[PDB]
Design an enzyme around this catalytic site. Structure first.
Site, PDB file in Angstrom:
ATOM      1  N   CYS A  84      32.982 -22.351 -36.096  1.00 55.52           N
ATOM      2  CA  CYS A  84      32.999 -23.602 -35.349  1.00 55.52           C
ATOM      3  C   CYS A  84      33.958 -24.675 -35.888  1.00 55.52           C
ATOM      4  CB  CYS A  84      31.575 -24.166 -35.229  1.00 55.52           C
ATOM      5  SG  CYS A  84      30.622 -24.177 -36.752  1.00 55.52           S
ATOM      6  N   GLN A 103      29.524 -32.112 -40.584  1.00 57.55           N
ATOM      7  CA  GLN A 103      28.902 -31.101 -39.740  1.00 57.55           C
ATOM      8  C   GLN A 103      27.476 -31.305 -39.257  1.00 57.55           C
ATOM      9  OE1 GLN A 103      30.211 -26.924 -40.647  1.00 57.55           O
ATOM     10  NE2 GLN A 103      31.497 -27.899 -42.209  1.00 57.55           N
ATOM     11  N   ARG A 150      27.326 -31.561 -44.630  1.00 53.15           N
ATOM     12  CA  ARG A 150      26.355 -31.658 -43.553  1.00 53.15           C
ATOM     13  C   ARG A 150      25.824 -33.080 -43.420  1.00 53.15           C
ATOM     14  NH1 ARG A 150      24.286 -26.425 -42.306  1.00 53.15           N
ATOM     15  NH2 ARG A 150      25.812 -26.813 -40.645  1.00 53.15           N
ATOM     16  N   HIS A 200      30.533 -31.442 -34.661  1.00 53.03           N
ATOM     17  CA  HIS A 200      31.136 -31.429 -35.987  1.00 53.03           C
ATOM     18  C   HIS A 200      32.273 -32.431 -35.930  1.00 53.03           C
ATOM     19  CE1 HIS A 200      28.760 -28.226 -37.300  1.00 53.03           C
ATOM     20  NE2 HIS A 200      29.591 -27.206 -37.183  1.00 53.03           N
TER      21      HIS A 200
END
Lengths: 356, 356
Positions: free
Chosen positions: B121, B148, B255, B262
């Site tokens: 991704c 993310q 994260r 993202h």
């Protein structure tokens, strides 16, 4: 004992200062006089301020820009310690971060500098983590990507962030309580809530909870940087005293849903090739607050996070490794509390030096 | 018409795929056969699978590594389209992102390639944003800092994130409604809750809401990168067909508290000095989804955020400017939906080509 006047001691930053000072009993080493802007002495009474040896203000740039000039004009020769950005770039002002630039400060006092200002939170937090490399003269330039907390914008910003997060969960309170609901239905609801008119976004001008904002402060049309990103190059070098031979520090400043800690991802271009172990040693040895976090998952998850760092004077730095661009390219990630080393601590520390 | 078998069409990623295919009425151009693992054919019945022309699976790596080799062994001659990372780096497999590598895909089809896999991704969202710069052979290297979303990790992670946010707010619900309450008291409480043992952190292994985690996937001993960061270099180049003469792509994958988008901060070293205006034109021209957001506050706040892009196929890129390191250093920030171009969309698209 020096007579010290305090202004803005009831604001968020000012309150952290009062707590840290109390925690360290700094008040028994000085005579404090508390001022107020409320209609304690009046923060606008120049005559009263002139009686003081030192003035510590966390009131803000507007106050400083109004009072400081008047007081200096009286002939007052005392010290002005400021947390606001207003005077940082003045030629008769030194940006303080004693664990990093104690020499610049010592020489400045000797030179007769009467104005010391704390530096930008992102820059001071960076220097507290990566200071070792600058001291050894290893940094050629640094690429920065920040993950900044709401506290940098203000108390109401922190509150708005918490409110936003609450409303996002509330939007799917029922759906979340049953283990078999559709996750896509859940996000459709959360996202619809985030985009709703009644979603509180007046402080940030956009949602922060469940999102991010890749813009902090105003734009400087000439470079395209926002003021926040501009301070990285401007302030890093004034602090280290390299204004005439500045080290490139630039990147993007992004706001994320955290309360008090700023986190930063670094791509550091070193001047030479060194073993990772040597680099780690150089970093950990710079000061007593930096903490090198081994490149391990479990240790990183437990140590290199706002959850862990918030409200502490610890400046962990990890994910240290060489990058694919070359052996001179170092990757690093750090986390630090914005209100402590990023705001109240450098001021509390310079104050302790002025009243010793 | 082509007989296509679908596996994992009920999971989160498979559901996005099913929804997208319905939206584009893709089922009118093929004969769909749905499989199941529950005790409609069995996803494990190799004889049933072998009767299809194409197999589109969103089931996951364990399923593929179990069934794929077993089906290929029956002498099956059809096509295997996978959203999982399991086969990405196999020499007889091509990673698809047609708006970026249609030529690699086309050559692979004519050559006899029978396995097509969606890409990571973060790499896909990056290439959809600045694919124009690679296209022009202008990239020397790229240092990445990502923000993310939880969706990358999984559905239960999204739920944990939402639940963590709810708890953080509920811990200070009355204080927040009180316009005169202490922000420090509020943060002290929120932070305590985030550290409580009962704070739901089993899916992430740490708090995400109100924090961040600078570590995604497993460690890659060899380089120190996590597997997520490692895919940047490996997959960017395989997708572009540059595995023989790789462009360095590396950085830190972090994260944050976002549901399905993202975001990425880029420091791109270009091969030549080009005007900014020219660079934006090169980026905007690559494909119809990328959207260049002028480096302005109000527009950036409204356009370059997870809040804006979630659930859409748009890939905005902004904050474009030259960095202090030099006119050959480009700053860029992009936001993209992790479930669309980051997962189901490249798979949906290659399937459309395979059934034409």
């Amino acid at each position: 004992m020096k007579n010290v006047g305090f202004i803005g001691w009831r604001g968020m930053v000012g309150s952290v200062l009062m707590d840290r000072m109390s925690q360290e009993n700094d008040f028994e080493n000085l005579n404090p006089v508390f001022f107020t802007t409320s209609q304690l002495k009046s923060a606008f009474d120049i005559e009263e301020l002139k009686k003081l040896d030192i003035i510590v203000t966390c009131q803000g740039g507007d106050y400083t820009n109004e009072v400081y000039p008047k007081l200096k004009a009286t002939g007052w020769d005392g010290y002005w310690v400021d947390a606001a950005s207003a005077l940082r770039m003045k030629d008769d002002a030194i940006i303080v971060l004693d664990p990093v630039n104690q020499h610049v400060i010592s020489e400045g006092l000797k030179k007769g500098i009467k104005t010391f200002v704390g530096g930008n939170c992102t820059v001071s937090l960076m220097l507290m983590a990566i200071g070792g490399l600058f001291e050894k003269d290893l940094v050629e330039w640094i690429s920065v990507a920040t993950y900044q907390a709401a506290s940098g914008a203000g108390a109401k910003n922190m509150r708005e962030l918490l409110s936003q997060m609450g409303l996002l969960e509330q939007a799917v309170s029922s759906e979340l309580k049953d283990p078999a609901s559709s996750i896509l239905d859940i996000e459709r609801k959360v996202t619809a809530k985030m985009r709703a008119d009644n979603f509180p976004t007046d402080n940030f001008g956009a949602a922060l909870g469940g999102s991010l904002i890749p813009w902090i402060d105003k734009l400087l049309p000439e470079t395209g940087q926002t003021k926040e990103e501009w301070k990285g190059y401007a302030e890093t070098n004034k602090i280290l005293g390299l204004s005439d031979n500045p080290i490139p520090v630039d990147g993007l400043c992004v706001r994320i849903g955290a309360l008090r800690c700023h986190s930063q991802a670094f791509t550091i271009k070193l001047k030479k090739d060194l073993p990772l172990e040597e680099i780690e040693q150089i970093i950990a040895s710079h000061n007593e607050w930096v903490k090198v976090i081994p490149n391990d998952k479990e240790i990183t998850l437990r140590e290199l996070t706002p959850a862990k760092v918030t409200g502490t004077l610890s400046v962990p730095v990890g994910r240290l490794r060489k990058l694919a661009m070359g052996p001179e390219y170092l990757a690093a990630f750090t986390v630090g509390d914005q209100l402590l080393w990023g705001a109240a601590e450098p001021v509390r520390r310079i104050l302790k030096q002025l009243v010793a």
